[PDB]
Design an enzyme around this catalytic site. Sequence first.
Site, PDB file in Angstrom:
ATOM      1  CB  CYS A  30      -0.916  -0.042   1.227  1.00 43.06           C
ATOM      2  SG  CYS A  30      -1.999   1.412   1.384  1.00 43.06           S
ATOM      3  CB  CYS A  33       1.516   1.352   4.169  1.00 45.03           C
ATOM      4  SG  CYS A  33      -0.145   1.038   4.757  1.00 45.03           S
TER       5      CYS A  33
END
Lengths: 105, 107
Positions: A30, A33
């Site tokens: 992600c 992230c």
Amino acid sequence: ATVTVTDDSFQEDVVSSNKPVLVDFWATWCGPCKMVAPVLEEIAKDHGEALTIAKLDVDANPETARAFQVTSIPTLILFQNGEATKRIVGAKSKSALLRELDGVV
Amino acid sequence: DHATVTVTDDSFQEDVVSSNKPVLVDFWATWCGPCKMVAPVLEEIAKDHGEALTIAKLDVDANPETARAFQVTSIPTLILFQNGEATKRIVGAKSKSALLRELDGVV
Ligand code: NA
């Protein structure tokens, strides 16, 4: 500076923590992230005495992910005395996270 | 034509982007509770409508290239593809009635 917590260690490392703990509930692929991770580290280096910063890999630790109903990533949850007191969703700048941590750092 | 299918990073271009049927892709994860609620809903839609609409499941953690490609930051996310164009993005578990309404004109 950042610490790794797991389903097994969560109770000792976070819920029973003497000081505040900000937990990053994250996943590997992600984008946001990947971006927030070093920002958190820089925060942990600067404010280590006041605040513990921890990482919880949701795919590897689904029990704890489910316990806090993590459905967007990253989800950052601040714990103080065993209780979730702030929930912040998305990558944030250093300044934006410091806003959210006002009075904790 | 009557059941969901699995798609992967390796199969996505052929199975979804190049499909002539519309395809609804369920970006899901083992660590996400609401995915368990939407899975049987999708199966029931496939039973009723699978000759018109393919329903595909993409496990985001096993298929990080496709997950990142569609910037899925909330789970589940359901994306409708028509001629490979992502034309609708539906976030979260939905009831069968609700999802059917989202798919107005498709099924
Ligand atoms: Na998984």
